[PDB]
Structure 1
Amino acid sequence: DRGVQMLLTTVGAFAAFSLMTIAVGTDYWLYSRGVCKTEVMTHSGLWRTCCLEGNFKGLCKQIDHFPEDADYEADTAEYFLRAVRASSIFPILSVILLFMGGLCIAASEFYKTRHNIILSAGIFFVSAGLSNIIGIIVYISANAGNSYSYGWSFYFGALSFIIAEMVGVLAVHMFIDRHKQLRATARATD
């Protein structure tokens, strides 16, 4: 079942990476009323807000991550949260960790003798899922600071988190199986 497990792990890793990259790139994260001119139905992502319908349908404007005026630097928690949201450090970190896990799996398919590469890939996928969770929480909290809804980029990110956790579990299972087989062979040959 090593071949089936490896195929499932690779397919899931690629799917999670692609979903996370698409969610980061696209701008259907939220559906809220707003403007795209520097109150109409607009769809926004992590970088830009674009208006749908109306006279200016299709016009995109970059998201202002520091609204209001006077630049009130009274509470450092708000500034830290706003900087974290503007940088989108956690979704990008999730993308990078998923890419690293996929590269680890690909390299392991070459060497086939260093078991720690599989463990590294599993750790990468689990950490990518955790980073995705943090990024989702940061995005929602920053949005908190008019009925709204979440688009398909948000749910693509959620699905990517789920698949990343599943692939991490599969990679850990493969590492455990490899070490069990090594121990069994050593016991038989001793």
Structure 2
Amino acid sequence: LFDRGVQMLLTTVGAFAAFSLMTIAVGTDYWLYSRGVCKTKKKNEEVMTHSGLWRTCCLEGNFKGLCKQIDHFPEDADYEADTAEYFLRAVRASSIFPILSVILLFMGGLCIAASEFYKTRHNIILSAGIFFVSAGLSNIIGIIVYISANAGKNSYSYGWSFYFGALSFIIAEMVGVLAVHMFIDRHKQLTG
């Protein structure tokens, strides 16, 4: 890729766009459409549940904004403690993977600020690519566990903050490609 003068702006604006989209998605208490309830006892019978991983809500009910935070409930003959079931519940009952992706991408933002502070450290921008890829992995694994639980039919449909979270992965890959161009430029500078 040419235009190395603009590539620093293009990568930083892409990274900031990804960070804003991801943080809005994780802050938002809903991700994608489904049917169910807003809050248990549109409360019991019928509403579009605007599902989400960390928090969940609803849209176009007789009432709106009565959102909910994830919890768990018992089932017949238990089986809650099973090696698969307890694993799935312990994963699903936490905001781990999206908020870790947020933290990694924000530290990617703090990393690229080392283009101006602690300047001329060259290959240190290596850490940006690590942050982009690890944020991507955390995002995709979060979406995988989210959909894998949520898809159990409840007529799900994809929503705005979902589109933000998913798009942030592709943005993070394109930003990563530019960050690798930045790194290998710093490498060619170090080797002359």
Measure the CA separation in 2 of the matches of 1:144 and 1:80: 18
Contact kept, 8 Å, 1:27 with 1:153, in 2: the verdict is no
Partner of 1:34, secondary structure, is coil
Q: Give 4+ residue runs of structure 1 displaced > 6 Å after superposition.
A: none
Shift of 1:9: 1.3
1:52 equivalent to 2:59? Answer: yes
Structure 2 residues not aligned, in runs of 5+: 41-45
Contact kept, 8 Å, 1:108 with 1:117, in 2: the verdict is no
Q: Deviations over 1:22-48 (max 9, x none)?
A: 111113322122123432222122233
Shift of 1:63: 3.1
Shift of 1:161: 0.8
1:178 equivalent to 2:180? Answer: no
Partner of 2:34, secondary structure, is strand
Q: Which has more helix, going by share of residues?
A: 1
Compare 95-104 and 106-115 and name the one that shifted more. Answer: 106-115
Shift of 1:140: 0.8
Computing the radius of gyration over CA atoms, which structure comes out larger, 1 or 2? Answer: 1
**Is the alpha carbon distance of 1:127 and 1:29 closer, same or farther for their aligned partners in structure 2, counting shifts above 3 Å?**
same
Partner of 1:81, secondary structure, is helix
**Is the alpha carbon distance of 1:63 and 1:69 closer, same or farther for their aligned partners in structure 2, counting shifts above 3 Å?**
farther
**Is the alpha carbon distance of 1:148 and 1:180 closer, same or farther for their aligned partners in structure 2, counting shifts above 3 Å?**
same
Measure the CA separation in 1 of the matches of 2:126 and 2:86: 37
Measure the CA separation in 1 of the matches of 2:71 and 2:169: 27
TM-score normalised according to structure 2 size: 0.84
Contact kept, 8 Å, 1:66 with 1:82, in 2: the verdict is no
**Is the alpha carbon distance of 1:81 and 1:111 closer, same or farther for their aligned partners in structure 2, counting shifts above 3 Å?**
same
Contact kept, 8 Å, 1:28 with 1:152, in 2: the verdict is no
Alpha carbon RMSD of aligned pairs, Å?
A: 2.3
Shift of 1:61: 2.7
Measure the CA separation in 2 of the matches of 1:8 and 1:54: 42
The count of residues paired between Structure 1 and Structure 2 equals: 184
Shift of 1:135: 0.8
TM-score normalised according to structure 1 size: 0.85
Identity of aligned residues (%): 99
Q: Deviations over 1:58-81 (max 9, x none)?
A: 322333344645642352222222
Partner of 1:33, secondary structure, is coil
Measure the CA separation in 2 of the matches of 1:66 and 1:14: 39
Shift of 1:6: 1.0
